[PDB]
A paper describes a structure:
B cell lymphoma-2 (Bcl-2) antagonist/killer ([name]) is a critical executor of mitochondrial outer membrane permeabilization (MOMP), the key process of the type I programmed cell death called apoptosis. [name] is a member of the Bcl-2 protein family, which comprises 3 subgroups: proapoptotic [name]-only proteins, antiapoptotic Bcl-2 homologues, and downstream MOMP executors [name] and Bcl-2-associated X (Bax). Once activated, [name] and Bax undergo a conformational change to oligomerize on the mitochondrial membrane, which causes MOMP to be characterized by loss of mitochondrial membrane potential (ΔΨm) and release of cytochrome c. [name], a male germ cell–specific protein exclusively expressed during spermatogenesis, was reported to contain a [name] domain and to induce germ cell apoptosis and male mouse infertility upon overexpression.
Next, [name](23–185;C166S) bound to human [name](76–101) was subjected to crystallization, leading to structural determination of this complex to a resolution of 2.2 Å. In this complex structure, the human [name] [name] fragment forms an amphipathic α-helix and is accommodated in the [name]-binding groove of the single [name] molecule, similar to its binding to the corresponding region of Bcl-xL, with the equivalent positions of the 5 key [name] consensus residues. With the lack of detergent treatment during the purification and crystallization steps, C-terminal helix swapping of [name] was not observed in our structure, which was reported to be induced by the combination of detergent and the [name] fragment and necessary for the 2:2 complex form. The intermolecular binding between [name] and [name] was mainly mediated by hydrophobic interactions: 4 hydrophobic [name] consensus residues (Leu82, Leu86, Ile89, and Ile93) and 2 additional nonconserved isoleucine residues (Ile78 and Ile79) of human [name] associate with Ile81, Gly82, Ile85, Tyr89, Phe93, Met96, Leu97, Leu100, Tyr110, Lys113, Ile114, Gly126, Val129, Ala130, Leu131, and Phe134 of [name]. We also found that Asp91, another conserved [name] consensus residue in human [name], contributes to complex formation by mediating electrostatic interactions with Arg127 and hydrogen bonding with Asn124 of [name]. The guanidinium group of Arg87 of [name] also forms a hydrogen bond with the main-chain carbonyl of Ser117 of [name]. In the complex structure, a 310-helix between α2 and α3 (α2–α3 310-helix; residues 84–88) and the α3 helix (residues 89–100) of [name] containing the steric hindrance-associated residues are moved away toward the opposite side of α4, which widens the [name]-binding groove of [name] and enables the human [name] [name] domain to be accommodated in the pocket. Furthermore, binding of human [name] [name] induces the formation of a “cavity” in the middle of the [name]-binding groove of [name], which was previously reported to reflect the conformational change of [name] or Bax induced by [name] domain binding.
Author numbering:
A (entry chain G), B (entry chain E), C (entry chain S), F (entry chain W): 22 to 48, 56 to 182
D (entry chain Q): 22 to 48, 56 to 180
E (entry chain U): 22 to 48, 57 to 181
G (entry chain M): 22 to 48, 56 to 183
H (entry chain I), I (entry chain K): 22 to 49, 56 to 182
J (entry chain P): 77 to 94
K (entry chain V): 77 to 98
L (entry chain F), M (entry chain T), N (entry chain X), O (entry chain H), Q (entry chain J): 76 to 98
Write the structure that this text describes.
Amino acid sequence: MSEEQVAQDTEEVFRSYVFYRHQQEQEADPEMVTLPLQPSSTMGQVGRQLAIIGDDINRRYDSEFQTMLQHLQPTAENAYEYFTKIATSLFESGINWGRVVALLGFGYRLALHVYQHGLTGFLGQVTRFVVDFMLHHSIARWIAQRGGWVAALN
Amino acid sequence: MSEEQVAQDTEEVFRSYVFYRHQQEQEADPEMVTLPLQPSSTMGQVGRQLAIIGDDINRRYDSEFQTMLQHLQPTAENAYEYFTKIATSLFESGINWGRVVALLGFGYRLALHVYQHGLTGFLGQVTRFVVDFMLHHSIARWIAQRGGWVAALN
Amino acid sequence: MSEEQVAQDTEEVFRSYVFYRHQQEQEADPEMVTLPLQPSSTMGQVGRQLAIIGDDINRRYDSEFQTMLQHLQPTAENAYEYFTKIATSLFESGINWGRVVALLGFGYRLALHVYQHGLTGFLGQVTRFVVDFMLHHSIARWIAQRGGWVAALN
Amino acid sequence: MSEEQVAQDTEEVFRSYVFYRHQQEQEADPEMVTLPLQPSSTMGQVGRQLAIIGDDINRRYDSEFQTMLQHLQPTAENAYEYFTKIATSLFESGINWGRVVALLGFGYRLALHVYQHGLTGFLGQVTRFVVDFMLHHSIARWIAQRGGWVAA
Amino acid sequence: MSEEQVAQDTEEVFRSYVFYRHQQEQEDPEMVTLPLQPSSTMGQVGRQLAIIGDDINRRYDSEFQTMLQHLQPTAENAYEYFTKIATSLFESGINWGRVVALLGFGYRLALHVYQHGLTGFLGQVTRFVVDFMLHHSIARWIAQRGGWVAAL
Amino acid sequence: MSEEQVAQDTEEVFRSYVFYRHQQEQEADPEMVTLPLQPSSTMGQVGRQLAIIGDDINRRYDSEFQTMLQHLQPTAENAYEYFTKIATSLFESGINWGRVVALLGFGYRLALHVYQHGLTGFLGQVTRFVVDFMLHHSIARWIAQRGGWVAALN
Amino acid sequence: MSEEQVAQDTEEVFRSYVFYRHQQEQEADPEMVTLPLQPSSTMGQVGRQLAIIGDDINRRYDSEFQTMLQHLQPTAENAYEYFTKIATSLFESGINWGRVVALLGFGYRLALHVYQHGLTGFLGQVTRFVVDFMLHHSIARWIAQRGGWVAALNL
Amino acid sequence: MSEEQVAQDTEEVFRSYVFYRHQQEQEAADPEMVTLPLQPSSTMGQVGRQLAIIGDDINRRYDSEFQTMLQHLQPTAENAYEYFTKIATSLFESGINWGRVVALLGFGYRLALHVYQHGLTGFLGQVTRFVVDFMLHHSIARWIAQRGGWVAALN
Amino acid sequence: MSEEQVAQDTEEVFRSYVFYRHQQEQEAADPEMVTLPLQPSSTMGQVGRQLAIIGDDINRRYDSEFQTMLQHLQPTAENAYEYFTKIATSLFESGINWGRVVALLGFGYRLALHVYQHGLTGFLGQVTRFVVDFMLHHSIARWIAQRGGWVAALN
Amino acid sequence: EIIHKLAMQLRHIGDNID
Amino acid sequence: EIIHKLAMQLRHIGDNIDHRMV
Amino acid sequence: EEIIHKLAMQLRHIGDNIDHRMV
Amino acid sequence: EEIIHKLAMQLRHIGDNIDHRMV
Amino acid sequence: EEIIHKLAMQLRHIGDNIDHRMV
Amino acid sequence: EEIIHKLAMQLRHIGDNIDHRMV
Amino acid sequence: EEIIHKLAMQLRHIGDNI
Amino acid sequence: EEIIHKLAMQLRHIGDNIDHRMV
């Protein structure tokens, strides 16, 4: 299992996590309801499962985050810088599987922030922030060393 | 009646068993509500009767199966291996028409379970496991030696 | 038992708390009479049991309580602040189940008093200040250690 | 007469029991009075004659029984564990036509104690408890050896 | 103030508790010589909490020693018994009072086994105390009040 | 419970007994009053509880008993000859815990009498005499079978 | 003296005990009077002896014992289990010569109660439960350490 | 900061941790550690003294089960790397933090000490090599590198 | 594992057994055994460290009549191998045992020390060869190599 | 134990509905 | 001041429901 | 292997149940 | 099994009482 | 288990009464 | 830089709490 | 010889009394 | 292997505790 493999597999792990986490939160953003899913990949099983384990923690830390992002005001131009800088200090002290899911939650929380604030059609940019940050900052490598994203279904 | 006649006849018995069994139950998986059915095939009558002649027995153990399937965590990659191992242990002690009906329903329960867990558009892979198992493990020949799937309508 | 499930279940316990206690204190609030309760929930009988136990320990303080909530004169802006400012001092001395019924009981006495000053349709936000105070202040974590809200039927 | 046919027929045997027995105790549960009844089936008359041939001995033992279900306090999750486990011993002494009307009689009350305790929309599951317990514990068959519920 | 912070400060809170409680008892060698941390606010915690229950722990002595003797805690079941008693104390609820009643269970079982031939086990009581409190949310309670220094 | 396990444990089961039994027999010999006790073994508790249950019965026959040990007059060489000889008879009838404390009580009484007759440092042999005899005369296999010395704590 | 030489004398010791003590009691059980013994059987004195010295004690507890085991109503299936189980608790507290004799008395109490209850021919199995419990709980070793069953003629 | 710079630097932060944590323990023996030589004027012996300091309370406790587990492991000269590697990969299987890198140094200490105590003398340069070789091959030296090196541990 | 490989291993197993038993016996002298030098980083010192400690409890019940029997033996530089050989062939004449291999090394120790106290200095290296050369020629080393080697003893 | 006295009584009416 | 008087009154209803509920 | 096997015998049981019905 | 509870019940009354004084 | 115990506990008494006639 | 960090520290809290669920 | 029988039978009493 | 694993979780535990101490 390669780190580049984990990197390309990350596009569908992310896309699906957004789809399924948005879907429980509703029980809005139409770019996440209409979000296309790939047929018959186990990376859509990964993103469905990871969307679900962040069920307790993520519900609490809700208005706390939106009030902090409102002070950030990320635009189409500084959001990848802002994505990087937050995500770079999340893993500065360490890595674990739970922090990997918190980095997909922040990609979901930031994908939704900017839609609600008028940046439409940006979902596909937040996905590359997640893929690209992960591939230049050793997160994909870390995951590939554990058997890939598929190892997370335990 | 040849075993390869039973092998090609089996895709329509399973597809149709899924459609009609999903339908009584629902009275969900929209890959099974919108499952196409060949017109004027007797095999669509075989899957309709096999699906009804397990109704009560099958809802009885519905909860034990779901929770047993979750610890398995089948994926696009290991579902065949897992389908074969369960199905070779089922007929190791014995073959009878009910057990053949139980191999259809476990093809139905594994098909629905992966969907509910995020493996979409996989219905056709589950029908192939059913058909390719039966040919390669003497279940098709068993059935052909008795007139085919049509003998079951008794 | 995840703390997340206790907090989602707190929807039902409180709704049913208000409805089943109102049904006794009325022998009015239109929102609490017409209050609907999901069907076949255990948090529905749980709502029922918590509202019937300390009836007199509740009908013993109506004067003192409905007197102080009127000088405080809650509004739709400071409501949550007061709700959390009051509820912090409650469990700061310690946790038990009677104080957990005492937390709910005040919401019924908030959402209702509030209702009597002109704040219509406010029962779904008092339901919210209950759910979003427990999970964030370890009240949903304490319950999770014991089983859930159903264990309260002892 | 297949046991399965006995099992499928039981659904409206119970509804009619539950519908008709509540009409007795009344002269509440709006889930049993609204309880729609299937048309032109004997099973509506079968359950009707068994809810009436039981209101002598039942109407007396009510307080004795319901006091125990408030000590047992069943939930939407343990309801099947209990109903199976009570009716199981009920029948480990033996089986007679009094005890089958006695079974359906506990479904009437169980579906009524939880309604009176806040468990709405469960009357459809109490029929299943009846319909499942009887086939899986050889009561749909024993009834079939006579001709179905109609012999009753 | 972190749970970890409370867990560590718990070591001295107990060893700092036993000391002054034994001394106030006389007005065990291993309890008279019990080493105390120089200059810690925790050292004082373990003697304020020791003086408050002086009334409630004065009465309940002959209570507890008879119940301990029949339980017969050895070096093996010592942690088993400690976790099982102390769990059952906090199930019902929590409060500062039951926090203090838990350290008293740490002085009373420390003192029981020494009297019954368990020389030098007070080093395992302290950990029973701190390992019961970190794995059962009791440490998380205290830090949420500010830490033990709030108790004062 | 292993055989010589109970054997090795017999090392300080005895050292405890003699310690506690002398502390009460006075109610002297510094070879035992100073007999160093381990920290944190249940085997110490066993030697204390048996020290104080037999003490009363071990308070009448002390006049008659040791009067015999003079007329016997055992030295530091036949000591093991004499010890084994009497203990082989103490069990030649029947085994039970009461007599197992009777052997240790002879172990307390032989230790005491050798000091009182000029034999110094021989408590380090009346220990070994007590451990070897039991592993080589079916007594340690009697104790291990019932859970061991800890089983005596009843 | 191997604890196994104790194992086979016991098939002869028990049978003797049952028989010789059956006749004193009559003052029944086919299988205990049919019950034959090898000749020049030195171990037959043992079962004759042990049945004697313990008779006036065993003529006292016969009352409450005929009603206890019937509530147990042993079978062919749970008879061994109840055997080994009742006998493990008789030696968890202490061995001596009476407890080993008091052990055999109950096989007879079981092998006879079982016959009056309609379990013909079970006399062979009761002899094994004795031997089999005795070898597998260190009761036969206790006898070979002291010599054997012949030394029981010193009571 | 490069990977091999961190891997090269782990000789003296480990050798130093050992001398300093032992000097720690022994004021409250392994003469291989007392007489350990310490490279003059390097920040990595600065780094080893801080890590040995930080890790005592948490260690001072779990010194019993470690002793008993390492005894039933019975590492030898031949199997000690395999066991070190198998234990060290399970430690970082779940995640990587700075406390687990200090925890790793401590089990190099616990291991080098148990095997000496049990007769494996002059083994400290191989344990040091296990530590340096595991880190470089299982990506511990690269995690440390993309954070400044070991000197970053001084916060 | 070669039985000729078990021969050089025995040089360091015996010399380790000697040093550590002597050491633990003292702490409860032959200065050739206090100053006994030991190979650094050899598992065979772990073997000799463990084999000395298992026999300790029993090897204090018999320290006496051994002492007095080797006195009327009066071993010399000339007859000590012969007596060693003939004591050691009689030890494994009725069987071979892991315990008799530890009781063989113990008599090497006890005869090494008898001769020293009786004025035979500088003789430990000949004793080690009696042990090494006896074991090779009397099928003791092949037995151990079949078991896996001396390291099999750390179990 | 509640489970037995349930069936016990339900038995009573049962054999009485008989 | 009021915010507090609301909590302690509720402590008394809680610990009174407590004994009732245990 | 152990999850795998439990699913198979469950299938046998439902499979032998259905057989008796069609037989 | 019933001693552990009887300990934790009185242990609870000591707490309940001490709590009244602290707070 | 109570039939088993009282049966065994019965057997000890005759086992120590018959033991004395023995010893 | 200062808001950025508070988002990172909160993600760590959320992350480490979800880790405790998956291990 | 005889004194030997005497100790063992005492402790026996003491043992069986215990 | 059961020992090797028990040793690795004591090390995570001491590791995460030293961890909370360092950040």
